[PDB]
Design a protein around this ligand. Structure first.
Ligand SMILES: C[C@@H](O)[C@@H](C=O)[C@@H]1NC(C(=O)O)=C(S[C@@H]2CN[C@H](C(=O)N(C)C)C2)[C@@H]1C
Length: 340
């Protein structure tokens, strides 16, 4: 009978987790999308209606995965390249970049920089490639374009052409500021790293109706980064739940290796200035062999919510249930760790 991809139990878990989290942190709304790795199949989409495809926001640090993937794919850095991180860094073009949390100046590998989500390390990674090349990766990752899912009212998001970027834009676009995305776009993006560098268009329709039940096909996929890059990003993402990672404890799924990135993104409020926050979380599980990709956002007006405390618990509840329901055996290999 059923022509849609939505898993009804998973959908209930999603909605329940999402509602509870929005209320828990005093948010105004939230969204979550779960994609099946390798197929484009949408297993859950919360809330009901079109929010997950029509609400745009600056995603913050989850956007660092695009910057990182570009620099790795262009063979400009490795996971063990070292950069100095610090509270602030004055850049060649005169911009000051801050980490938004004071901390000791120290040297750290690319892997540690991403696990810790340090902006001062991230902008130096981004500076190893040209803006036109970065911008091209952004497009390939699906930003600035509708995903094509058969739901109404989908937004393309906002990706200004790189030729238009000023000194500040050059940097803010490396960590998900000055760009706007949908939740569905964030899920499509992260799945790439569990799909050998391939992006697969998301679908909600499994197949319609002689009047025969003919299933829908996978849709035109595209190589975004190489298989090696995808695997390296997937390894780096496993740093999130390790000691020192931004998702330590709170993003852990008992028995399963998690690959994730958090975000705490400033957003323009009702009265013009940067008063709002989107807490973002993008993850793949099990990390050694991803079966689902998840993106969660919780949006708050006139306050700060953190990717980790607002949105990670939504992913955890979703992910615990999905693994059991999909009969995925617990991880038998260690969580990946690069030296930091
Ligand atoms: C645009 C960037 O400034 C932020 C990206 O979203 C940083 N990334 C995160 C994050 O949620 O991962 C936090 S806040 C979080 C809460 N404490 C940590 C922190 O303050 N760091 C790592 C600087 C991390 C940054 C502001």
């Amino acid at each position: 009978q059923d022509p849609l991809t939505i898993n009804a139990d998973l959908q209930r878990v999603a909605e329940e987790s999402l509602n509870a989290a929005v209320k828990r942190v005093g948010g105004v709304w939230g969204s979550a999308a779960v994609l099946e790795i390798g197929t484009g199949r949408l297993l859950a989409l919360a809330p009901g209606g079109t929010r997950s495809v029509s609400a745009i926001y600056e995603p913050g640090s989850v956007g660092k995965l695009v910057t990182l993937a570009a620099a790795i794919d262009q063979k400009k850095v490795t996971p063990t390249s070292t950069f100095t991180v610090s509270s602030t860094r004055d850049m060649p073009n005169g911009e000051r970049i801050s980490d938004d949390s004071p901390h000791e100046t120290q040297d750290m590998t690319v892997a540690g920089i991403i696990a810790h989500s340090y902006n001062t390390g991230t902008v130096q990674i981004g500076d190893t490639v040209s803006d036109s090349v970065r911008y091209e990766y952004m497009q390939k990752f699906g930003w600035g374009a509708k995903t094509g899912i058969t739901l109404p009212s989908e937004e393309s998001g906002i990706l200004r052409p790189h030729t238009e970027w000023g000194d500040r834009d050059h940097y803010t676009t490396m960590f998900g500021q000055g760009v706007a995305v949908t939740t569905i776009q964030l899920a499509q993006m992260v799945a790439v790293f569990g799909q050998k560098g391939v992006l697969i268009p998301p679908r909600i329709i499994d197949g319609y109706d002689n009047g025969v039940y003919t299933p829908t096909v996978m849709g035109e996929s595209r190589q975004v980064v190489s298989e090696d890059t995808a695997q390296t990003v997937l390894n780096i993402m496993q740093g999130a739940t390790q000691p020192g990672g931004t998702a330590e404890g709170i993003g852990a799924v008992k028995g399963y290796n998690v690959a994730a990135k958090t975000g705490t993104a400033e957003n323009v409020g009702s009265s013009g200035s940067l008063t709002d926050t989107a807490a973002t979380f993008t993850a793949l599980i099990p990390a050694e062999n991803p079966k689902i990709a998840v993106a969660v956002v919780i949006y708050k007006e006139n306050g700060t919510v953190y990717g980790s405390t607002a949105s990670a618990p939504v992913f955890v509840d979703i992910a615990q249930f999905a693994m059991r329901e999909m009969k995925i055996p617990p991880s038998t290999v260690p969580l990946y760790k690069y030296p930091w």
